[PDB]
Design a protein around this motif. Structure first.
Motif, PDB file in Angstrom:
ATOM      1  N   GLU D  57      44.359  43.648  40.225  1.00 15.25           N
ATOM      2  CA  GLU D  57      44.947  42.828  39.879  1.00 15.25           C
ATOM      3  C   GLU D  57      45.229  41.070  40.167  1.00 15.25           C
ATOM      4  O   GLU D  57      44.701  41.050  41.511  1.00 15.25           O
ATOM      5  CB  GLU D  57      46.230  43.029  41.134  1.00 15.25           C
ATOM      6  CG  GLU D  57      47.460  43.302  39.899  1.00 15.25           C
ATOM      7  CD  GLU D  57      48.594  43.726  41.209  1.00 15.25           C
ATOM      8  OE1 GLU D  57      48.921  44.789  40.905  1.00 15.25           O
ATOM      9  OE2 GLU D  57      49.779  43.333  40.885  1.00 15.25           O
ATOM     10  N   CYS D  58      44.180  40.420  38.865  1.00 16.44           N
ATOM     11  CA  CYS D  58      44.390  38.654  39.223  1.00 16.44           C
ATOM     12  C   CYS D  58      45.586  38.282  39.493  1.00 16.44           C
ATOM     13  O   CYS D  58      46.623  39.656  39.253  1.00 16.44           O
ATOM     14  CB  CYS D  58      44.126  39.195  37.950  1.00 16.44           C
ATOM     15  SG  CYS D  58      43.749  36.963  38.178  1.00 16.44           S
ATOM     16  N   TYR D  59      45.573  37.544  40.254  1.00 15.13           N
ATOM     17  CA  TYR D  59      47.275  36.645  40.965  1.00 15.13           C
ATOM     18  C   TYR D  59      48.137  36.579  39.846  1.00 15.13           C
ATOM     19  O   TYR D  59      48.803  36.236  40.148  1.00 15.13           O
ATOM     20  CB  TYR D  59      46.299  36.007  41.837  1.00 15.13           C
ATOM     21  CG  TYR D  59      47.895  35.080  42.422  1.00 15.13           C
ATOM     22  CD1 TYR D  59      48.603  35.277  43.562  1.00 15.13           C
ATOM     23  CD2 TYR D  59      47.965  33.591  41.446  1.00 15.13           C
ATOM     24  CE1 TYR D  59      49.419  34.466  44.183  1.00 15.13           C
ATOM     25  CE2 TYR D  59      49.512  33.423  42.167  1.00 15.13           C
ATOM     26  CZ  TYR D  59      50.098  33.580  43.154  1.00 15.13           C
ATOM     27  OH  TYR D  59      51.405  32.841  43.546  1.00 15.13           O
ATOM     28  N   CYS D  60      47.044  35.361  38.964  1.00 15.07           N
ATOM     29  CA  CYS D  60      48.005  35.342  37.791  1.00 15.07           C
ATOM     30  C   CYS D  60      47.521  36.336  36.789  1.00 15.07           C
ATOM     31  O   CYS D  60      48.622  36.029  35.082  1.00 15.07           O
ATOM     32  CB  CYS D  60      47.454  33.982  37.229  1.00 15.07           C
ATOM     33  SG  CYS D  60      45.476  34.020  35.831  1.00 15.07           S
ATOM     34  N   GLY D  61      47.599  37.515  36.935  1.00 20.25           N
ATOM     35  CA  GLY D  61      47.144  38.476  35.761  1.00 20.25           C
ATOM     36  C   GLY D  61      46.493  38.244  34.859  1.00 20.25           C
ATOM     37  O   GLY D  61      46.985  39.618  34.062  1.00 20.25           O
ATOM     38  N   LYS D  62      45.428  37.738  34.538  1.00 20.96           N
ATOM     39  CA  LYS D  62      44.326  37.414  32.927  1.00 20.96           C
ATOM     40  C   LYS D  62      43.605  38.262  33.382  1.00 20.96           C
ATOM     41  O   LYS D  62      42.806  38.703  32.186  1.00 20.96           O
ATOM     42  CB  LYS D  62      43.717  35.722  33.232  1.00 20.96           C
ATOM     43  CG  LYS D  62      43.417  35.445  32.238  1.00 20.96           C
ATOM     44  CD  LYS D  62      43.162  33.985  31.889  1.00 20.96           C
ATOM     45  CE  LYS D  62      41.994  33.714  32.431  1.00 20.96           C
ATOM     46  NZ  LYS D  62      41.297  32.608  31.996  1.00 20.96           N
ATOM     47  N   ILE D  72      35.855  35.691  39.144  1.00 20.28           N
ATOM     48  CA  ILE D  72      36.784  35.102  39.728  1.00 20.28           C
ATOM     49  C   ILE D  72      37.050  34.177  38.795  1.00 20.28           C
ATOM     50  O   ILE D  72      37.017  33.797  38.241  1.00 20.28           O
ATOM     51  CB  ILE D  72      36.075  33.584  40.568  1.00 20.28           C
ATOM     52  CG1 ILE D  72      35.391  34.218  41.507  1.00 20.28           C
ATOM     53  CG2 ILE D  72      37.208  33.050  40.603  1.00 20.28           C
ATOM     54  CD1 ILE D  72      33.818  34.694  41.772  1.00 20.28           C
ATOM     55  N   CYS D  73      38.712  34.731  38.797  1.00 23.52           N
ATOM     56  CA  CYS D  73      39.619  34.251  37.771  1.00 23.52           C
ATOM     57  C   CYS D  73      39.539  32.299  38.193  1.00 23.52           C
ATOM     58  O   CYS D  73      40.252  31.912  38.857  1.00 23.52           O
ATOM     59  CB  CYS D  73      41.363  34.543  38.337  1.00 23.52           C
ATOM     60  SG  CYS D  73      42.157  33.845  37.216  1.00 23.52           S
ATOM     61  N   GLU D  74      39.660  32.006  36.652  1.00 28.81           N
ATOM     62  CA  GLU D  74      39.133  30.231  36.839  1.00 28.81           C
ATOM     63  C   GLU D  74      40.293  29.496  37.282  1.00 28.81           C
ATOM     64  O   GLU D  74      40.625  28.460  37.424  1.00 28.81           O
ATOM     65  CB  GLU D  74      39.151  30.044  35.253  1.00 28.81           C
ATOM     66  CG  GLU D  74      39.812  30.891  34.224  1.00 28.81           C
ATOM     67  CD  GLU D  74      39.257  29.858  32.724  1.00 28.81           C
ATOM     68  OE1 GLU D  74      39.061  28.941  33.269  1.00 28.81           O
ATOM     69  OE2 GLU D  74      38.983  30.291  32.133  1.00 28.81           O
ATOM     70  N   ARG D  75      41.864  30.293  37.032  1.00 26.50           N
ATOM     71  CA  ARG D  75      42.626  29.724  37.083  1.00 26.50           C
ATOM     72  C   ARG D  75      43.432  29.749  38.921  1.00 26.50           C
ATOM     73  O   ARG D  75      44.107  28.781  39.254  1.00 26.50           O
ATOM     74  CB  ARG D  75      43.967  30.254  36.192  1.00 26.50           C
ATOM     75  CG  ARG D  75      45.338  29.776  36.583  1.00 26.50           C
ATOM     76  CD  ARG D  75      46.186  29.892  34.525  1.00 26.50           C
ATOM     77  NE  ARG D  75      46.835  31.314  34.637  1.00 26.50           N
ATOM     78  CZ  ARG D  75      48.191  30.992  34.526  1.00 26.50           C
ATOM     79  NH1 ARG D  75      48.865  29.683  34.838  1.00 26.50           N
ATOM     80  NH2 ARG D  75      48.776  32.347  34.238  1.00 26.50           N
ATOM     81  N   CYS D  76      43.368  31.652  39.258  1.00 24.38           N
ATOM     82  CA  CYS D  76      43.458  31.021  40.944  1.00 24.38           C
ATOM     83  C   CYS D  76      42.612  31.267  41.733  1.00 24.38           C
ATOM     84  O   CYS D  76      43.443  31.878  42.388  1.00 24.38           O
ATOM     85  CB  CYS D  76      45.111  32.082  40.179  1.00 24.38           C
ATOM     86  SG  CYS D  76      44.409  34.010  39.802  1.00 24.38           S
ATOM     87  N   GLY D  77      41.562  31.916  41.281  1.00 25.70           N
ATOM     88  CA  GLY D  77      39.922  31.803  42.264  1.00 25.70           C
ATOM     89  C   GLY D  77      40.239  33.205  42.702  1.00 25.70           C
ATOM     90  O   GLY D  77      39.999  33.613  43.855  1.00 25.70           O
TER      91      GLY D  77
HETATM   92 ZN   LIG Z   1      44.097  34.272  37.697  1.00 22.33          ZN
END
Ligand SMILES: [Zn+2]
Lengths: 65, 97, 218, 145, 32, 49, 98, 49
Positions: D57-62, D72-77
């Protein structure tokens, strides 16, 4: 999943890898594993201006010189 | 007036004599200054700095301990302790061990 | 004068026991040695220092603008501006140095309630930093009285902060628990909060010990 | 590979070892978020440092589902990975000043005291900013002047 | 002997020292 | 304990930025040292948090 | 064998340069004698009395201006600090043993 | 002797002999040792792990 990779560097000379998804873009700067900010490869004046009109400060500085 | 003089002439010269002896204390501290010596008197430490700061380095805190460890040489102390163990007795030898 | 009654003997007995911690934060002596000596300053000198501080801050602002947007005046004038900013920094340092013993004398009133004397002194020092940031030559006050409010309110805020370094002694917990139980019982049966005399009656201790132990309660 | 778990060694960790263990520096004193019970960013429970509380579950949901691994999510790491990583991922705090380790200062005998030949009382005075110690002297300069 | 008595701290220090050297002699110093 | 250590460290960084005189800065350093000691072994030295 | 100073004995506390003098030694010796214990037992009382007098004078000097006995907690902890410093003070202990 | 062993320290007999034979085969004086009898309690306290 299809994937991608990027890298960042910090002024101390260390470098770090970051895998990404294929459909992902890349930020220009990154908070790395180190904790430093790396690159892709109430202050006193706020308080003084609140109680002053800067012409007073201009005179104050002119007196110093 | 004579009694006032016996207080004045005495105390005025005595304070100057104590200061003059304090200068000798400063010089004698400087001449035996060595690493790992503690200086607790802030007046003495400040005078040592003002006079001879370029000749030594003082510090406190864990950073001073770190600098002491950097300057530390393990082999010299180990061999000195070994020399002491086969020469001294009693509590001195026990502490060396 | 000279007295060696039993109370003095008990006091020395307590002092030898307390002396088992070397660099105790409850002792300001080393901090006092570190302060050294700086003379108390009159109103004219304090307003002079504040004037220098504000002048240096404005010089810093203009120098920061000129370090980026070009328009730099020749180096000879820039050197005088470079002198003004340093003068302001030195003035701030001196004005803070002048009141560390004021911080100490304000802190000494809050000791014995859980926080060490040096921690209270640090909170008072930060209150003093807050004070120098709001001082104004226009208002004309003595800096000591003005900064006293900031020092004491900072100390109270740290004391009244839920997260604090309360460091109660090990050899007081049991008597504090006994005090709590006895005060609870006396409140429940007497119909009102018990005065320290009744507590001393129940605990078999002198009342001023009741007032001393109650300071650790929170 | 427990078939090669033959010996267990212990030793002093240096700052570089602590930095190599850690996934990121804890910057803020924050707890779990009082407003929504989510972990704070850069707090002691930060997901970007210690991993996500809930699997993939991504922190920013992407990125939010099982098929995604390791990214790694490019928007929240945050890394899209299994939540168990929060039981193993280490953090660190970068001190603005050195501090001595209490075990090697306190406790009789004093490891530091014996190493430096400093009495425990004197070492305690030095460490807690109550006395000055002379660290080094340029002996030859003094000798000639 | 009655007029002078014994100094408590000196006797305690002598006892702890004696224990230390006896432990050394027994060859079990590092365990005490 | 970790929160206390982080608070002391951040305040020490701020003080070093503010250019405060050495006395206040190293008093904050002493507080940081005490906070780390409390984090590792709380009761070992003197009276515990 | 319970001697008194011929001349005052500098103690040289790190900050207040205390001394022990004829009056303090005489009064502490009288207290120790009054205690009624043997010599090697009244030695402890003598040491305690001298330590108390020196410590109280030293804290009164340190607390000049800003500190008074009504600050009971600060006063007692300052006293404890000074007593701790005295206990390990080699010159003070040597003078008392003399 | 010519070993790394600390004087006065307790040493397992097997390790003692192994290091002595190593050093003597490498020209060093072997360490001198005295057997010590230990109760089961002190023998347990003197464990190597
Ligand atoms: Zn994210």
């Amino acid at each position: 999943a299809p994937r991608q990779v990027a890298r960042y560097r910090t002024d101390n000379g260390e470098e770090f890898d970051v895998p990404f998804a294929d459909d992902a873009e890349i930020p220009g700067t990154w908070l790395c594993r180190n904790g430093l900010e790396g690159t892709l490869i109430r202050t006193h004046w706020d308080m003084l201006l609140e109680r002053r009109s800067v012409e007073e400060l201009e005179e104050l500085l002119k007196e110093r010189l | 007036v004579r009694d006032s003089g016996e207080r004045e002439m005495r105390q005025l010269r005595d304070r100057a004599q104590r200061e003059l002896d304090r200068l000798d204390e400063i010089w004698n501290t400087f001449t035996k200054l060595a690493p790992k010596q503690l200086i607790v008197d802030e007046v003495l430490y400040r005078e040592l700095q003002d006079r001879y700061g370029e000749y030594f380095t003082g510090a406190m805190g864990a950073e001073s301990i770190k600098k002491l460890i950097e300057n530390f040489d393990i082999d010299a102390e180990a061999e000195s302790l070994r020399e002491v163990i086969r020469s001294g007795k009693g509590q001195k030898k026990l502490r060396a061990l | 004068d000279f007295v060696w009654d039993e109370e003095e003997s008990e006091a020395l007995r307590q002092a030898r026991k307390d002396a088992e911690l070397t660099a105790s934060a409850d002792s300001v002596r080393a901090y006092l040695k570190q302060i050294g000596k700086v003379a108390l300053l009159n109103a004219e000198e304090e307003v002079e220092l504040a004037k220098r501080i504000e002048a240096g801050l404005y010089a810093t602002q203009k120098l920061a603008e000129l370090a980026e947007k070009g328009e730099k005046l020749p180096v000879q004038q820039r050197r005088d501006m470079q002198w003004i900013c340093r003068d302001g920094d030195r003035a701030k340092n001196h004005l803070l140095e002048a009141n560390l013993r004021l911080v100490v004398s304000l802190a000494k009133r809050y000791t014995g309630r859980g926080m060490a004397f040096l921690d209270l002194i640090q909170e008072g020092n930060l209150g003093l930093i807050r004070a120098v940031e709001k001082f104004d030559y226009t208002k004309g006050y003595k800096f000591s009285t003005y900064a006293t409010w900031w020092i004491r309110q900072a100390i109270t805020r740290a004391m009244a902060d839920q997260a604090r370094t309360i460091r109660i002694p090990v050899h007081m917990v049991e008597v504090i628990n006994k005090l709590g139980r006895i005060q609870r019982e006396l409140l429940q049966d007497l119909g009102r909060e018990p005065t320290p005399e009744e507590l001393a009656k129940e605990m078999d201790i002198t009342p001023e010990k009741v007032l001393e132990i109650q300071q650790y309660a929170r | 590979d427990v078939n090669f778990f033959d010996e267990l060694r212990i030793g002093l960790a240096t700052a570089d070892d602590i930095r190599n263990w850690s996934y990121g520096e804890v910057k803020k004193p924050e707890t779990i978020n009082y407003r929504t019970l989510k972990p704070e960013k850069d707090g002691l429970f930060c997901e970007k440092i210690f991993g996500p509380t809930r699997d993939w579950e991504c922190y920013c949901g992407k990125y939010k589902r099982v098929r995604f691994k390791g990214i790694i999510c490019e928007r929240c790491g945050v890394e899209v990975t299994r939540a168990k990583v929060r039981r193993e991922r280490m953090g660190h705090i970068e001190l603005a000043a050195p501090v001595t380790h209490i075990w090697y200062f306190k406790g009789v005998p004093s490891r530091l005291g014996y190493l430096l030949d400093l009495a425990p009382k004197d070492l305690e005075k030095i460490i807690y900013f109550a006395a000055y110690v002379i660290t080094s002297v340029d002996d030859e300069m003094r000798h000639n002047e | 002997v009655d007029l002078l008595g014994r100094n408590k701290a000196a006797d305690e220090a002598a006892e702890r020292e004696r224990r230390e050297e006896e432990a050394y002699a027994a060859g079990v110093l590092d365990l005490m | 304990l970790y929160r206390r250590v982080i608070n002391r460290n951040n305040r020490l960084k701020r003080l070093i930025d503010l250019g405060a005189p050495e006395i206040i800065v190293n008093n904050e350093k002493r507080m940081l040292q005490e906070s780390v000691d409390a984090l590792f072994d709380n009761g070992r030295r003197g009276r515990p948090v | 064998r319970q001697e008194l100073p011929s001349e005052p004995i500098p103690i040289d506390l790190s900050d207040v340069t205390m001394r022990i003098d004829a009056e303090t030694a005489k009064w502490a010796r009288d207290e120790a004698r009054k205690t009624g214990l043997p010599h090697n037992e009244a030695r402890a009382e003598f040491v305690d009395v001298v330590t108390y007098v020196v410590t109280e004078r030293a804290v009164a000097r340190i607390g000049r201006g800003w500190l008074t006995r009504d600050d009971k907690h600060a006063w007692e902890k300052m006293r404890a600090d000074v007593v701790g410093e005295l206990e390990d003070h080699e010159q003070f202990n040597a003078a008392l043993d003399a | 002797g010519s070993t790394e062993f600390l004087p006065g320290s307790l040493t397992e007999r097997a390790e003692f002999e192994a290091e002595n034979r190593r050093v003597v085969a490498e020209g060093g004086e072997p360490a001198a040792g005295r057997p010590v009898l230990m109760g089961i309690t002190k023998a347990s306290l003197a464990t190597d792990s």
